[PDB]
Design a protein around this ligand. Structure first.
Ligand SMILES: *[C@@H]1O[C@H](CO)[C@@H](O[C@@H]2O[C@H](CO)[C@@H](O)[C@H](O)[C@H]2NC(C)=O)[C@H](O[C@@H]2O[C@@H](C)[C@@H](O)[C@@H](O)[C@@H]2O)[C@H]1NC(C)=O
Ligand SMILES: *[C@@H]1O[C@H](CO)[C@@H](O[C@@H]2O[C@H](CO)[C@@H](O)[C@H](O)[C@H]2NC(C)=O)[C@H](O[C@@H]2O[C@@H](C)[C@@H](O)[C@@H](O)[C@@H]2O)[C@H]1NC(C)=O
Ligand SMILES: *[C@@H]1O[C@H](CO)[C@@H](O[C@@H]2O[C@H](CO)[C@@H](O)[C@H](O)[C@H]2NC(C)=O)[C@H](O[C@@H]2O[C@@H](C)[C@@H](O)[C@@H](O)[C@@H]2O)[C@H]1NC(C)=O
Ligand SMILES: *[C@@H]1O[C@H](CO)[C@@H](O[C@@H]2O[C@H](CO)[C@@H](O)[C@H](O)[C@H]2NC(C)=O)[C@H](O[C@@H]2O[C@@H](C)[C@@H](O)[C@@H](O)[C@@H]2O)[C@H]1NC(C)=O
Ligand SMILES: CC(=O)N[C@@H]1[C@@H](O)[C@@H](O)[C@@H](CO)O[C@@H]1O
Ligand SMILES: CC(=O)N[C@@H]1[C@@H](O)[C@@H](O)[C@@H](CO)O[C@@H]1O
Ligand SMILES: [Ca+2]
Ligand SMILES: [Ca+2]
Ligand SMILES: [Mn+2]
Ligand SMILES: [Mn+2]
Lengths: 237, 237
């Protein structure tokens, strides 16, 4: 089977999306994952957006795994440089019907009290105890402590283009990050066996989070906007 | 044992380069792999450019393999759309002291008579009997019949940015192609075991070719210019 969707922009009450927590669509078409009031990003915010319908990444009958490609544009504006912006956004794949997890450094996808598996590509802006210098792109498998990491310089408020591609034959998950205004290109890849970590049917989407209250810093925040998003998956068997 | 060089521009008679066949550096600093006379690309042309010093991709004593990253910008101008431009350019790695191979669809790196091993990333503009729709990026190992392929749309005469990265721990060779003027991004990756195909010391460089006379089409041509090039390899030990 081949499934695919495209979003050139977003409208209020998009029937193909599942918004959770602080996630919402602005009047001028952008998907704001985290809370922003009067043009100002708030702390203690967590939001997710999932594609309404589940997609099948693999079939147990034939044992075949799907190959997929996803592209999206996001923007992170960091109004308060000091002490430190937080926390970042991620593109992720998880079992269907999950609830928003812990916020802060966990981006809203990890729940210590009852963990569910997931594969995620993160754009980390805050340095937790388990993180290397930030910002950085990271490939996460069942944990927020990345298997592979690469540093990148953020184009504050600028637009970022991301291409995530997964080839089932080689099991290579490669992501590309581009800031057209700066002409900078960042690349990272790692081997991930989807069949080994996720169930046959999953949900795909984004999740982000701002500074957690425990950090005692209202300045630890930023925006996490998704401007556009296309997804395509192919399962031969 | 880290090695790296950077050519932000090309000078007449570069002491660090080895030009072969039709390859030459224009007065305005660009590296023209194939022949172009009076601003017009000729057919029956083949040229290569190798970094003068050999680089060590792996060490037999420790068994360790090098990781490397290379970035470059090229431009392909296609003056004659009909009947078909040809043939393309490639970035490649081969044993030191090799001679230009067959031209045409072989880009000047393959020699049926006496083949030598090589790993190359191709940007193919002509569709040979062994090729899929063109243009396409392709990863070649010891042969011009690609292991992995991805189609791309050329920005005629525009500038292209390429990022080729090889991670020895995962053996993943991933390349990224970007046409800044169109904002388009193309990505491809595959697993290649350098230690298994190439000798300890190799040469890195470019090779390109225009329409072969046997095709009986003088229009089967285009330019193959390299604007800038940086390389870097880290061999632990
Ligand atoms: C949180 O962000 C605020 C806005 O960026 C910081 O205040 C700004 O601090 C600038 C330099 O310290 C100063 O030039 C600006 O006028 C001021 N902006 C306003 C109107 O708040 C804030 O910095 C703290 O608060 C200011 C008022 C001073 O007390 C500074 O010494 C403080 O660092 C940031 N707070 C934190 C926790 O960093
Ligand atoms: C961070 O956001 C939380 C919700 O997104 C806040 O808790 C919410 O507080 C509301 C009170 O105004 C209450 O109706 C909601 O049920 C509750 N949500 C849940 C289930 O936690 C949380 O802090 C709360 O609100 C402040 C004003 C105090 O009333 C606290 O005691 C609450 O826990 C926010 N964290 C902070 C430190 O502001
Ligand atoms: C394609 O380019 C070739 C050069 O790499 C031409 O081959 C000829 O090679 C000879 C020895 O290697 C050399 O003396 C010639 O100068 C050169 N071509 C000439 C005459 O300039 C080849 O030219 C054709 O083939 C040669 C053997 C001669 O018969 C020429 O008259 C032919 O044009 C070029 N092919 C074509 C079809 O243009
Ligand atoms: C080889 O490239 C040439 C330049 O692009 C083509 O000639 C051009 O063809 C145009 C129509 O395709 C015509 O309007 C132009 O006047 C002409 N310009 C030149 C430089 O001659 C050429 O096209 C064929 O050959 C020429 C000589 C004409 O007879 C055209 O009508 C033919 O289509 C290209 N050759 C091929 C195989 O198309
Ligand atoms: C574990 C955890 O969520 N840690 C958070 C961190 O991610 C960030 O939100 C910070 C902001 O000041 O507050 C805490 O340290
Ligand atoms: C095998 C070979 O070199 N084939 C070439 C092809 O690569 C291209 O140059 C074409 C142009 O007319 O002429 C021939 O078919
Ligand atoms: Ca973090
Ligand atoms: Ca070809
Ligand atoms: Mn991280
Ligand atoms: Mn090819």
């Amino acid at each position: 089977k081949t499934i695919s969707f495209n979003f050139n922009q977003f409208h209020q009450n998009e029937e193909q999306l599942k918004l959770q927590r602080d996630a919402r669509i602005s009047s001028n078409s952008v998907l704001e994952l985290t809370k922003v009031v009067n043009g100002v990003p708030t702390w203690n915010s967590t939001g997710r957006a999932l594609y309404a319908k589940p997609v099948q990444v693999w079939d147990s009958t034939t044992g075949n795994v799907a190959s997929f490609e996803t592209r999206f544009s996001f923007s992170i504006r960091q109004p308060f440089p000091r002490p430190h912006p937080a926390d970042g956004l991620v593109f992720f794949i998880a079992p269907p019907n999950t609830q928003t997890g812990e916020g802060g450094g966990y981006f809203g996808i990890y729940n210590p009290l009852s963990p569910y598996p997931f594969v995620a590509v993160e754009f980390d802006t805050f340095r937790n105890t388990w993180d290397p210098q930030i910002p950085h792109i990271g490939i996460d498998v069942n944990s927020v402590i990345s298997t592979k990491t690469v540093p990148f310089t953020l184009d504050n408020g600028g637009i970022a283009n991301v291409v995530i591609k997964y080839d089932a034959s080689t099991k290579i998950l490669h992501v590309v990050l581009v800031f057209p205004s700066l002409g900078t290109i960042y690349t990272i890849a790692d081997i991930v066996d989807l069949k080994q970590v996720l169930p046959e049917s999953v949900n795909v989407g984004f999740s982000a989070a701002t500074g957690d209250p425990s950090g005692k810093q209202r300045n630890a925040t930023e925006t996490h906007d998704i401007l556009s998003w296309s997804f395509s998956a192919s399962l031969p068997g």
